[PDB]
Amino acid sequence: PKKVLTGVVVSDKMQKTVTVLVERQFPHPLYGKVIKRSKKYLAHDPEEKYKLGDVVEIIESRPISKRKRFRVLRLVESGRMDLVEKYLIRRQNYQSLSKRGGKA
Amino acid sequence: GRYIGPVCRLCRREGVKLYLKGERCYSPKCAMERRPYPPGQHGQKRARRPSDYAVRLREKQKLRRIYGISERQFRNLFEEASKKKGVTGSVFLGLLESRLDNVVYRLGFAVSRRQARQLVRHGHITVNGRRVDLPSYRVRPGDEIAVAEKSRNLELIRQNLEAMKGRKVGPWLSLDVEGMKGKFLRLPDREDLALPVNEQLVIEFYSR
Amino acid sequence: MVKIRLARFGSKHNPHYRIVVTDARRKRDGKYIEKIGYYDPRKTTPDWLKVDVERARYWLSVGAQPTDTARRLLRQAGVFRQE
Amino acid sequence: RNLSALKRHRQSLKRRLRNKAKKSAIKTLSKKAIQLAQEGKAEEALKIMRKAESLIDKAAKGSTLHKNAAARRKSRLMRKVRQLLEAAGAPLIGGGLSA
RNA sequence: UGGAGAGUUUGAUCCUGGCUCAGGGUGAACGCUGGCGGCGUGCCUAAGACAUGCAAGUCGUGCGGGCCGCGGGGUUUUACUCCGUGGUCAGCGGCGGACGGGUGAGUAACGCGUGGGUGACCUACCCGGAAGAGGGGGACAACCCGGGGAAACUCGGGCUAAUCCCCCAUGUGGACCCGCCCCUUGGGGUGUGUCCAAAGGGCUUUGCCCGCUUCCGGAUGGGCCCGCGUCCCAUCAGCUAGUUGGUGGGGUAAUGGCCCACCAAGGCGACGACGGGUAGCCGGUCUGAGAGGAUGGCCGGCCACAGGGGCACUGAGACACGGGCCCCACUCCUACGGGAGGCAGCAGUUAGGAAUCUUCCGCAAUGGGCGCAAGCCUGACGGAGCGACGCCGCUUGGAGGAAGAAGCCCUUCGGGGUGUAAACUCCUGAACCCGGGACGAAACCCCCGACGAGGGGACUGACGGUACCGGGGUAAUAGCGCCGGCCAACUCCGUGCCAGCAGCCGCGGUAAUACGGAGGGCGCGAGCGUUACCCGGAUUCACUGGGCGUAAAGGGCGUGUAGGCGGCCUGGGGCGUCCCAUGUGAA
Ligand SMILES: [Mg+2]
Ligand SMILES: [Mg+2]
Ligand SMILES: [Mg+2]
Ligand SMILES: [Mg+2]
Ligand SMILES: [Mg+2]
Ligand SMILES: [Mg+2]
Ligand SMILES: [Mg+2]
Ligand SMILES: [Mg+2]
Ligand SMILES: [Mg+2]
Ligand SMILES: [Mg+2]
Ligand SMILES: [Mg+2]
Ligand SMILES: [Mg+2]
Ligand SMILES: [Mg+2]
Ligand SMILES: [Mg+2]
Ligand SMILES: [Mg+2]
Ligand SMILES: [Mg+2]
Ligand SMILES: [Mg+2]
Ligand SMILES: [Mg+2]
Ligand SMILES: [Mg+2]
Ligand SMILES: [Mg+2]
Ligand SMILES: [Mg+2]
Ligand SMILES: [Mg+2]
Ligand SMILES: [Mg+2]
Ligand SMILES: [Mg+2]
Ligand SMILES: [Mg+2]
Ligand SMILES: [Mg+2]
Ligand SMILES: [Mg+2]
Ligand SMILES: [Mg+2]
Ligand SMILES: [Mg+2]
Ligand SMILES: [Mg+2]
Ligand SMILES: [Mg+2]
Ligand SMILES: [Mg+2]
Ligand SMILES: [Mg+2]
Ligand SMILES: [Mg+2]
Ligand SMILES: [Mg+2]
Ligand SMILES: [Mg+2]
Ligand SMILES: [Mg+2]
Ligand SMILES: [Mg+2]
Ligand SMILES: [Mg+2]
Ligand SMILES: [Mg+2]
Ligand SMILES: [Mg+2]
Ligand SMILES: [Mg+2]
Ligand SMILES: [Mg+2]
Ligand SMILES: [Mg+2]
Ligand SMILES: [Mg+2]
Ligand SMILES: [Mg+2]
């Protein structure tokens, strides 16, 4: 079976491609606590239907480009800026953490 | 190895009456009488409270020395007795008693077990038919153990076996005297043995 | 090409061959495709030759060339109804 | 020294040229067909295209190409030739292409 | 079926806490010692350099020859020439040299492990099924002249065969463009158009054997893609222009930014990107009560490399260890222009090192390449040789006293030990000596039958006269470490913070069970000790299973971002969680 992941379109900023954040909820090896990891998938979006904030099922597929190896199967729920905002702010904080705290 | 040295010095280092000299023992001289104190120039002094370790070692040495075998070979049996099902304590003795050199002493073919391991090495003993020159061979129940056909009529044999007539053996052995044979019936119980040792200690020693 | 040969499994001076189908390129005693019986040249048991006769005719039906000296084991355990 | 499995080498060179020439034909022969197709030469363009497809399947037979290599090379041909005669031309010769 | 603790901070105590010891392991080495077999195992350094020898070929049933023969022909005879058959050599051609054998340098990576995908693909030889071979033409070596080069070799000229190359024909069928269909990524049909098939040998020769051609399946082997897993350093926080995506083309067996031209401006990172360190991964292995820790050596699977770097050719498959080209670094030959090599194949040599083996036998068995077969080739492999390096089995049967000009002890020659412990009472009989003597080996082949049908009383053994079996028979090697507590084992003399011991605590300063002898004792025994390393004890990185008032440890205090965590009731969903069935988890 070609694997089928579900996630959130956190990026529309591409030509015929959408970045889909997928979360996985698994128990920790030694310590047993449940932990939440995630990774982004570049998904192939032909008629650029699926827009930002959407929740889709992606599917394993014949390669389209480098690292772009998934096609968007079907839409599940429509929009939700919040899910993206959770992702946006995670990258916002990065502006600190550097060699110092700049004026950005 | 197999010790091979002054036997009766250790008859009294360990303490209790040991029978490795054979029937050299019953005539008041397996060193037992006269001097029951340990060998050396310190045999006659009141010792101290031996460490709980010592009394394990001392109890384990009795068992090794009474069957007269290598420590290297002795320990190899203890491993395969804890590994085996059932009580690790008595399983061990079931295997010591199962050794062929001992089954020959037990069946009164040779007056001594020590003197009997040499009897086997020289192929005077058969098992179900074929010769066996191995004191390590593990007899299984049903194995008729006999004296060599060609080598039958001999010195120590004729003497030792005739004095065995009018004598009975352990409940786990049958014996034919006037045909020198007799099967190995059963693996002996802890009750079936008159061994002046507390094996529970001997376990404790290795389970250190 | 897929074959049916003998792989050696005994020890020094104790040959115990094992009858396997395998790719011919692969080494003698390596990852074989499936084992279908054993051989014991010293005849030290009542059953010194055994072979899954059903599976044999499968692999034969899809072109497993057997060694000349392994063929004789199959003719031996009636892998072919010859008469 | 002298391992006479180097016979194998000199034998390759004999082969190397055969392919090298065989497909150097296709190259400069294919080029010709799509050239006549870009001018809508039609009759010439297919009379040349036809013998160019042949020369490909030929080269496939032996060892030079074989497989889908000859196939797609054939396909990349006709595909392009047609889309050039359809730019005002009409395949009025009817050589190697389906109506 | 599974869990032991001890010594050591104090005048003494309880904590805390480190150090050490007892256990198990080893591809080991070093010291003393060393009898036998069997089976394993044996450069951990220099992936340094390598002498010599052998290590991948085969087929005359693909083709034509060269050389040395021998015989039979045509002529009245010779000359000239025709045919047959031996031996040998390479050439052309087919298949194989991409397996097998070696290594761990590199690689933190879809490399490996595990589970899936391929409507994105390939697969020589093998298996099953359907169909086919008609006619013409060409060349290049071998050979034959000629030239250059010291050599390695190289150049020109001429002739010729083929299962070598090529053009027509046949189209079962297949490939391609374009369509009306069914499928749904490039999976199957179907029509018109174009395009593509072939080889001949062998005999007991007009019918059999080995081949050849196109196509459809099967099997085997493999490419590519994805989920998850996979070391340390944050005193490595930002990284990236083919960079990220797109349309189009190239290329491939096939997807893709793999590559190219244009267009868009993306992609990645604290869930650790980028950089640095280290390392082939796994099955497994050692340890541990387990959870865990350590490891990847033999064996098996995969990957990577073949003096270092790069590259294509040939082919079903190679970027090709014993193939080709180029550059570099070495070592050789050099008629100074140039040429020749690559043991990380089996042995072997030298170097480095604490340390790691025979230039042995064999084609008998197993496996592989080619061949119709006969057979050949096979340092794969099967055996032997060396090394207590490991594991296991085995021998040294054991019934008899004591005389120091520097080693038989015990109170200033004194009281007992060694100890039933023999240079000699019996008995059995390792070594050794005679004789028998293997299994491993029945196929390939030839006979009868339908050249697979119980007929092969064809032939086949390196190991090896070895193992095993029977007869004869000799009392016939014992070491090493310990003995103050942990830690089983105590006495005398010498020595006086000296000589020395020492794993930790410590002992030696004249009365030392601690140093050095001796007697005795303990442990183990063809071994015993030392050093090195791993886990253990260590609940001393605490998931099981620890802590932070004074023992080490609460941030100087706050605000709050990410993240972690969340009161009571009802309903849907079923990601976590639980259960059943099932596929996988090779050996
Ligand atoms: Mg050849
Ligand atoms: Mg203090
Ligand atoms: Mg003190
Ligand atoms: Mg104390
Ligand atoms: Mg090395
Ligand atoms: Mg000839
Ligand atoms: Mg030849
Ligand atoms: Mg790195
Ligand atoms: Mg994977
Ligand atoms: Mg010429
Ligand atoms: Mg041809
Ligand atoms: Mg044609
Ligand atoms: Mg490395
Ligand atoms: Mg080298
Ligand atoms: Mg290279
Ligand atoms: Mg090939
Ligand atoms: Mg090619
Ligand atoms: Mg390579
Ligand atoms: Mg090669
Ligand atoms: Mg080589
Ligand atoms: Mg070598
Ligand atoms: Mg040296
Ligand atoms: Mg060797
Ligand atoms: Mg063979
Ligand atoms: Mg070998
Ligand atoms: Mg036989
Ligand atoms: Mg043969
Ligand atoms: Mg037969
Ligand atoms: Mg003590
Ligand atoms: Mg000392
Ligand atoms: Mg003194
Ligand atoms: Mg002393
Ligand atoms: Mg001491
Ligand atoms: Mg031993
Ligand atoms: Mg721990
Ligand atoms: Mg633990
Ligand atoms: Mg805890
Ligand atoms: Mg603590
Ligand atoms: Mg303080
Ligand atoms: Mg404090
Ligand atoms: Mg505070
Ligand atoms: Mg929450
Ligand atoms: Mg809640
Ligand atoms: Mg669920
Ligand atoms: Mg399961
Ligand atoms: Mg398994």
mmCIF file of C-alpha atoms (C1' of nucleotides) in Angstrom, chain E residues 328-560:
data_model
loop_
_atom_site.group_PDB
_atom_site.id
_atom_site.type_symbol
_atom_site.label_atom_id
_atom_site.label_comp_id
_atom_site.label_asym_id
_atom_site.label_seq_id
_atom_site.Cartn_x
_atom_site.Cartn_y
_atom_site.Cartn_z
ATOM 1 C "C1'" C E 328 49.757 12.243 -10.177
ATOM 2 C "C1'" A E 329 53.252 9.458 -6.527
ATOM 3 C "C1'" C E 330 56.504 5.732 -6.246
ATOM 4 C "C1'" U E 331 59.817 1.239 -8.187
ATOM 5 C "C1'" C E 332 62.224 -0.786 -12.609
ATOM 6 C "C1'" C E 333 64.100 -1.106 -18.152
ATOM 7 C "C1'" U E 334 66.389 2.823 -21.044
ATOM 8 C "C1'" A E 335 70.640 2.628 -27.406
ATOM 9 C "C1'" C E 336 67.772 9.245 -23.454
ATOM 10 C "C1'" G E 337 63.464 9.586 -27.751
ATOM 11 C "C1'" G E 338 60.688 6.121 -24.924
ATOM 12 C "C1'" G E 339 58.546 1.894 -22.555
ATOM 13 C "C1'" A E 340 57.030 -1.478 -18.230
ATOM 14 C "C1'" G E 341 54.348 -2.535 -13.780
ATOM 15 C "C1'" G E 342 49.974 -2.583 -8.936
ATOM 16 C "C1'" C E 343 49.554 -9.901 -3.517
ATOM 17 C "C1'" A E 344 43.368 -5.698 0.262
ATOM 18 C "C1'" G E 345 44.027 -13.767 -4.709
ATOM 19 C "C1'" C E 346 47.285 -18.585 -2.309
ATOM 20 C "C1'" A E 347 51.579 -19.159 -0.076
ATOM 21 C "C1'" G E 348 56.027 -16.100 0.664
ATOM 22 C "C1'" U E 349 59.556 -11.862 1.604
ATOM 23 C "C1'" U E 350 60.871 -7.001 4.114
ATOM 24 C "C1'" A E 351 59.200 -2.920 7.078
ATOM 25 C "C1'" G E 352 56.420 -1.353 11.423
ATOM 26 C "C1'" G E 353 54.984 -3.848 16.029
ATOM 27 C "C1'" A E 354 54.067 -6.450 22.546
ATOM 28 C "C1'" A E 355 52.155 -9.788 18.761
ATOM 29 C "C1'" U E 356 49.720 -13.227 14.310
ATOM 30 C "C1'" C E 357 51.274 -19.471 10.244
ATOM 31 C "C1'" U E 358 53.571 -23.594 5.036
ATOM 32 C "C1'" U E 359 56.720 -20.399 -0.823
ATOM 33 C "C1'" C E 360 53.138 -27.960 1.789
ATOM 34 C "C1'" C E 361 49.178 -32.152 -0.791
ATOM 35 C "C1'" G E 362 44.933 -32.909 -4.052
ATOM 36 C "C1'" C E 363 40.749 -32.809 -8.609
ATOM 37 C "C1'" A E 364 38.963 -38.040 -4.830
ATOM 38 C "C1'" A E 365 34.262 -35.155 -2.663
ATOM 39 C "C1'" U E 366 31.318 -30.150 -3.023
ATOM 40 C "C1'" G E 367 30.564 -25.785 -5.991
ATOM 41 C "C1'" G E 368 31.612 -22.752 -10.507
ATOM 42 C "C1'" G E 369 33.041 -21.480 -16.280
ATOM 43 C "C1'" C E 370 33.083 -23.616 -21.065
ATOM 44 C "C1'" G E 371 32.059 -28.233 -24.076
ATOM 45 C "C1'" C E 372 27.127 -32.629 -27.644
ATOM 46 C "C1'" A E 373 30.470 -35.240 -25.138
ATOM 47 C "C1'" A E 374 35.247 -36.903 -24.021
ATOM 48 C "C1'" G E 375 37.415 -33.441 -21.102
ATOM 49 C "C1'" C E 376 39.803 -28.940 -19.510
ATOM 50 C "C1'" C E 377 40.390 -24.854 -16.101
ATOM 51 C "C1'" U E 378 39.383 -23.902 -10.693
ATOM 52 C "C1'" G E 379 45.669 -21.451 -4.214
ATOM 53 C "C1'" A E 380 36.983 -21.444 -4.829
ATOM 54 C "C1'" C E 381 37.166 -25.806 -2.055
ATOM 55 C "C1'" G E 382 38.328 -30.600 0.409
ATOM 56 C "C1'" G E 383 42.831 -32.241 3.676
ATOM 57 C "C1'" A E 384 47.651 -31.839 5.770
ATOM 58 C "C1'" G E 385 51.641 -28.382 8.160
ATOM 59 C "C1'" C E 386 53.205 -24.623 12.155
ATOM 60 C "C1'" G E 387 51.395 -21.853 17.347
ATOM 61 C "C1'" A E 388 48.659 -24.617 25.117
ATOM 62 C "C1'" C E 389 45.897 -19.118 20.919
ATOM 63 C "C1'" G E 390 40.760 -21.167 22.547
ATOM 64 C "C1'" C E 391 37.226 -25.081 23.790
ATOM 65 C "C1'" C E 392 36.666 -30.375 25.070
ATOM 66 C "C1'" G E 393 38.356 -35.324 26.206
ATOM 67 C "C1'" C E 394 43.254 -37.960 28.304
ATOM 68 C "C1'" U E 395 48.176 -39.828 30.941
ATOM 69 C "C1'" U E 396 52.127 -38.793 34.680
ATOM 70 C "C1'" G E 397 48.871 -46.382 38.894
ATOM 71 C "C1'" G E 398 51.542 -45.183 43.836
ATOM 72 C "C1'" A E 399 51.139 -50.021 50.269
ATOM 73 C "C1'" G E 400 58.021 -48.756 53.296
ATOM 74 C "C1'" G E 401 63.714 -43.052 55.948
ATOM 75 C "C1'" A E 402 66.416 -39.109 56.938
ATOM 76 C "C1'" A E 403 74.644 -38.494 57.220
ATOM 77 C "C1'" G E 404 74.212 -28.902 56.595
ATOM 78 C "C1'" A E 405 82.657 -27.590 55.521
ATOM 79 C "C1'" A E 406 77.152 -20.751 52.240
ATOM 80 C "C1'" G E 407 69.089 -24.331 50.972
ATOM 81 C "C1'" C E 408 65.202 -31.859 55.952
ATOM 82 C "C1'" C E 409 62.044 -27.617 59.191
ATOM 83 C "C1'" C E 410 59.752 -26.768 64.241
ATOM 84 C "C1'" U E 411 62.300 -22.908 71.724
ATOM 85 C "C1'" U E 412 70.487 -20.614 71.344
ATOM 86 C "C1'" C E 413 70.359 -28.895 68.595
ATOM 87 C "C1'" G E 414 64.695 -28.464 70.419
ATOM 88 C "C1'" G E 415 59.193 -30.386 70.560
ATOM 89 C "C1'" G E 416 56.793 -32.273 66.614
ATOM 90 C "C1'" G E 417 56.051 -32.165 61.051
ATOM 91 C "C1'" U E 418 56.423 -33.548 55.991
ATOM 92 C "C1'" G E 419 52.766 -38.723 55.991
ATOM 93 C "C1'" U E 420 51.213 -43.832 53.745
ATOM 94 C "C1'" A E 421 53.864 -39.798 51.378
ATOM 95 C "C1'" A E 422 58.833 -44.447 47.292
ATOM 96 C "C1'" A E 423 64.961 -45.371 44.255
ATOM 97 C "C1'" C E 424 62.004 -50.665 44.245
ATOM 98 C "C1'" U E 425 54.986 -55.972 47.502
ATOM 99 C "C1'" C E 426 51.650 -56.863 44.271
ATOM 100 C "C1'" C E 427 48.495 -55.453 39.937
ATOM 101 C "C1'" U E 428 46.765 -53.110 35.324
ATOM 102 C "C1'" G E 429 50.088 -51.361 30.784
ATOM 103 C "C1'" A E 430 50.403 -44.308 28.051
ATOM 104 C "C1'" A E 431 54.628 -44.539 24.896
ATOM 105 C "C1'" C E 432 56.366 -48.022 21.680
ATOM 106 C "C1'" C E 433 56.426 -52.928 18.376
ATOM 107 C "C1'" C E 434 54.081 -56.428 14.906
ATOM 108 C "C1'" G E 435 49.345 -57.591 11.402
ATOM 109 C "C1'" G E 436 44.264 -56.293 9.243
ATOM 110 C "C1'" G E 437 42.435 -51.634 7.146
ATOM 111 C "C1'" A E 438 38.429 -48.134 5.949
ATOM 112 C "C1'" C E 439 33.537 -45.156 5.353
ATOM 113 C "C1'" G E 440 33.584 -40.803 2.686
ATOM 114 C "C1'" A E 441 31.739 -43.016 -4.094
ATOM 115 C "C1'" A E 442 28.066 -42.836 -7.466
ATOM 116 C "C1'" A E 443 26.907 -40.329 -10.719
ATOM 117 C "C1'" C E 444 28.720 -37.974 -15.342
ATOM 118 C "C1'" C E 445 29.855 -42.623 -19.420
ATOM 119 C "C1'" C E 446 28.996 -47.224 -22.185
ATOM 120 C "C1'" C E 447 25.235 -51.420 -22.504
ATOM 121 C "C1'" C E 448 18.742 -53.167 -22.635
ATOM 122 C "C1'" G E 449 14.385 -49.739 -23.017
ATOM 123 C "C1'" A E 450 11.440 -43.961 -25.985
ATOM 124 C "C1'" C E 451 20.895 -42.342 -26.571
ATOM 125 C "C1'" G E 452 16.678 -39.854 -18.272
ATOM 126 C "C1'" A E 453 13.826 -47.194 -17.253
ATOM 127 C "C1'" G E 454 16.887 -50.214 -11.390
ATOM 128 C "C1'" G E 455 21.847 -53.306 -16.503
ATOM 129 C "C1'" G E 456 26.190 -48.969 -14.836
ATOM 130 C "C1'" G E 457 30.023 -56.935 -11.099
ATOM 131 C "C1'" A E 458 33.676 -50.122 -16.823
ATOM 132 C "C1'" C E 459 36.732 -46.139 -13.802
ATOM 133 C "C1'" U E 460 37.449 -43.488 -9.978
ATOM 134 C "C1'" G E 461 40.449 -41.644 -2.233
ATOM 135 C "C1'" A E 462 44.295 -35.976 -1.857
ATOM 136 C "C1'" C E 463 43.326 -37.141 3.504
ATOM 137 C "C1'" G E 464 46.283 -42.347 4.123
ATOM 138 C "C1'" G E 465 48.282 -47.312 5.531
ATOM 139 C "C1'" U E 466 45.376 -42.214 8.524
ATOM 140 C "C1'" A E 467 41.243 -43.405 11.606
ATOM 141 C "C1'" C E 468 39.398 -47.791 13.693
ATOM 142 C "C1'" C E 469 40.088 -53.119 15.040
ATOM 143 C "C1'" G E 470 43.108 -57.441 17.052
ATOM 144 C "C1'" G E 471 47.951 -59.531 19.208
ATOM 145 C "C1'" G E 472 52.895 -57.885 22.382
ATOM 146 C "C1'" G E 473 54.157 -54.681 26.198
ATOM 147 C "C1'" U E 474 57.607 -50.606 29.833
ATOM 148 C "C1'" A E 475 55.424 -47.590 36.632
ATOM 149 C "C1'" A E 476 55.673 -44.118 32.801
ATOM 150 C "C1'" U E 477 56.384 -35.561 32.633
ATOM 151 C "C1'" A E 478 54.343 -31.231 37.430
ATOM 152 C "C1'" G E 479 54.110 -27.096 37.443
ATOM 153 C "C1'" C E 480 52.442 -21.976 38.731
ATOM 154 C "C1'" G E 481 50.361 -18.358 42.029
ATOM 155 C "C1'" C E 482 49.395 -17.596 46.646
ATOM 156 C "C1'" C E 483 49.354 -17.817 52.735
ATOM 157 C "C1'" G E 484 48.461 -9.298 57.169
ATOM 158 C "C1'" G E 485 42.389 -7.598 56.317
ATOM 159 C "C1'" C E 486 38.960 -7.833 52.044
ATOM 160 C "C1'" C E 487 40.629 -13.542 50.830
ATOM 161 C "C1'" A E 488 40.971 -20.232 51.480
ATOM 162 C "C1'" A E 489 46.277 -20.955 53.714
ATOM 163 C "C1'" C E 490 51.540 -19.925 59.858
ATOM 164 C "C1'" U E 491 55.892 -21.089 61.731
ATOM 165 C "C1'" C E 492 61.713 -20.339 61.926
ATOM 166 C "C1'" C E 493 66.147 -17.581 60.390
ATOM 167 C "C1'" G E 494 68.212 -13.300 57.889
ATOM 168 C "C1'" U E 495 67.190 -7.940 57.376
ATOM 169 C "C1'" G E 496 66.499 -2.839 60.790
ATOM 170 C "C1'" C E 497 62.016 3.799 57.236
ATOM 171 C "C1'" C E 498 67.917 -0.029 54.614
ATOM 172 C "C1'" A E 499 67.050 -3.812 50.918
ATOM 173 C "C1'" G E 500 62.372 -4.130 49.301
ATOM 174 C "C1'" C E 501 56.523 -5.203 48.977
ATOM 175 C "C1'" A E 502 52.044 -2.895 47.484
ATOM 176 C "C1'" G E 503 45.013 -4.040 43.496
ATOM 177 C "C1'" C E 504 42.886 -0.587 47.956
ATOM 178 C "C1'" C E 505 43.860 -0.069 53.437
ATOM 179 C "C1'" G E 506 49.010 -0.325 54.287
ATOM 180 C "C1'" C E 507 54.036 -3.442 56.062
ATOM 181 C "C1'" G E 508 59.770 -2.340 57.036
ATOM 182 C "C1'" G E 509 62.755 2.411 62.643
ATOM 183 C "C1'" U E 510 66.048 -5.077 66.314
ATOM 184 C "C1'" A E 511 62.022 -9.395 68.935
ATOM 185 C "C1'" A E 512 58.197 -8.385 60.707
ATOM 186 C "C1'" U E 513 52.535 -14.512 59.915
ATOM 187 C "C1'" A E 514 53.137 -8.113 54.937
ATOM 188 C "C1'" C E 515 60.184 -7.535 52.751
ATOM 189 C "C1'" G E 516 64.301 -12.093 51.263
ATOM 190 C "C1'" G E 517 65.003 -17.417 52.250
ATOM 191 C "C1'" A E 518 63.421 -22.008 54.505
ATOM 192 C "C1'" G E 519 59.740 -25.739 56.475
ATOM 193 C "C1'" G E 520 54.592 -26.279 56.336
ATOM 194 C "C1'" G E 521 49.571 -24.878 54.269
ATOM 195 C "C1'" C E 522 45.856 -23.104 50.706
ATOM 196 C "C1'" G E 523 44.125 -22.578 45.452
ATOM 197 C "C1'" C E 524 44.500 -24.492 40.542
ATOM 198 C "C1'" G E 525 46.809 -28.022 37.405
ATOM 199 C "C1'" A E 526 49.389 -28.725 31.255
ATOM 200 C "C1'" G E 527 48.849 -25.189 32.565
ATOM 201 C "C1'" C E 528 49.449 -21.041 36.420
ATOM 202 C "C1'" G E 529 50.416 -15.749 36.949
ATOM 203 C "C1'" U E 530 51.009 -10.396 35.011
ATOM 204 C "C1'" U E 531 49.486 -6.424 31.815
ATOM 205 C "C1'" A E 532 45.659 -4.346 28.434
ATOM 206 C "C1'" C E 533 40.488 -3.797 27.208
ATOM 207 C "C1'" C E 534 34.650 -4.711 27.780
ATOM 208 C "C1'" C E 535 30.276 -5.362 30.990
ATOM 209 C "C1'" G E 536 29.556 -6.357 36.184
ATOM 210 C "C1'" G E 537 29.324 -5.136 41.213
ATOM 211 C "C1'" A E 538 27.622 0.889 40.140
ATOM 212 C "C1'" U E 539 20.390 2.078 42.599
ATOM 213 C "C1'" U E 540 27.857 5.923 40.858
ATOM 214 C "C1'" C E 541 23.277 9.426 34.636
ATOM 215 C "C1'" A E 542 18.794 6.094 38.712
ATOM 216 C "C1'" C E 543 13.122 4.184 32.541
ATOM 217 C "C1'" U E 544 12.737 0.183 36.128
ATOM 218 C "C1'" G E 545 16.027 2.902 40.148
ATOM 219 C "C1'" G E 546 19.119 8.688 42.856
ATOM 220 C "C1'" G E 547 19.193 13.461 44.354
ATOM 221 C "C1'" C E 548 19.411 19.811 45.446
ATOM 222 C "C1'" G E 549 17.750 23.830 54.219
ATOM 223 C "C1'" U E 550 23.516 22.513 56.438
ATOM 224 C "C1'" A E 551 26.756 16.821 52.415
ATOM 225 C "C1'" A E 552 27.627 18.537 45.132
ATOM 226 C "C1'" A E 553 23.243 20.896 43.528
ATOM 227 C "C1'" G E 554 17.126 26.054 43.329
ATOM 228 C "C1'" G E 555 18.398 30.322 38.306
ATOM 229 C "C1'" G E 556 19.507 37.289 42.314
ATOM 230 C "C1'" C E 557 13.961 38.522 41.230
ATOM 231 C "C1'" G E 558 10.336 39.172 37.662
ATOM 232 C "C1'" U E 559 7.404 39.474 32.790
ATOM 233 C "C1'" G E 560 6.188 36.362 29.466
#
